[PDB]
Design a protein around this ligand. Structure first.
Ligand SMILES: CC(=O)N[C@@H]1[C@@H](O[C@@H]2O[C@H](CO)[C@H](O)[C@H](O)[C@H]2O[C@@H]2O[C@@H](C)[C@@H](O)[C@@H](O)[C@@H]2O)[C@H](O)[C@@H](CO)O[C@H]1O
Length: 162
């Protein structure tokens, strides 16, 4: 393969450990939905530039939800919405403000890692789970696969683009 392997078309799958999934977001709305149905639900919402605070409807994990969103940047903003238990409300856990429209997720070392902050200085952070292998993802845009060992490149792509 290539080190940067893709693009792959939208699908649902169980990500392999130790590869970055790099998603080229092409629109507003749900970029991906990821859960193991027990303790980990993350959905990322894309919010186009210059959106004043507004309540929008999104379907996530087959549930209509209303999220208040805003973006006061020229860049796109990606909202990580999380719940760690089925009955809890989703909350906005992390954001990534980005000119490149690339969003990253990785299973590595018992945890899920994602990029947050603001390009070109976006950085990674981890999220815990007691069922890492059970996490599946439905990705609604094209994506790429890059080994964790080449995170340096992944970071470059997240921060400066393809
Ligand atoms: C110390 C370490 O290995 N950190 C890993 C993370 O990689 C770091 O990511 C931060 C942003 O949050 C910085 O970019 C930092 O430079 C990164 O460390 C560099 O790259 C990593 C992959 C290693 O090669 C390290 O030697 C190098 O300095 C990484 O994001 C997470 C999740 O994969 O694991 C951390 O251990």
């Amino acid at each position: 393969g290539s080190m940067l392997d893709g693009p792959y078309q939208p699908t649902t799958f169980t990500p392999p450990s130790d590869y970055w999934i790099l998603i080229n977001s092409n629109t507003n709305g749900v970029v991906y939905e990821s859960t193991n149905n027990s303790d980990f639900w993350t959905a990322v919402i894309a919010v186009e530039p210059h959106v004043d605070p507004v309540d929008r409807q999104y379907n996530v994990f087959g549930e209509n939800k209303q999220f208040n969103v805003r973006n006061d940047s020229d860049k796109w903003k990606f909202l990580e919405m999380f719940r760690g238990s089925s009955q809890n409300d989703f909350y906005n856990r992390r954001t990534l403000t980005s000119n490149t429209r690339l969003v990253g997720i990785l299973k590595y070392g018992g945890r899920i890692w994602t990029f947050h902050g603001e390009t070109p200085r976006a950085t990674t952070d981890s999220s815990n789970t007691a069922n890492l292998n059970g996490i599946s993802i439905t990705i609604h845009s094209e994506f790429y696969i890059i080994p964790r060992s080449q995170e340096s490149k992944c970071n470059e792509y997240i921060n400066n683009g393809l």
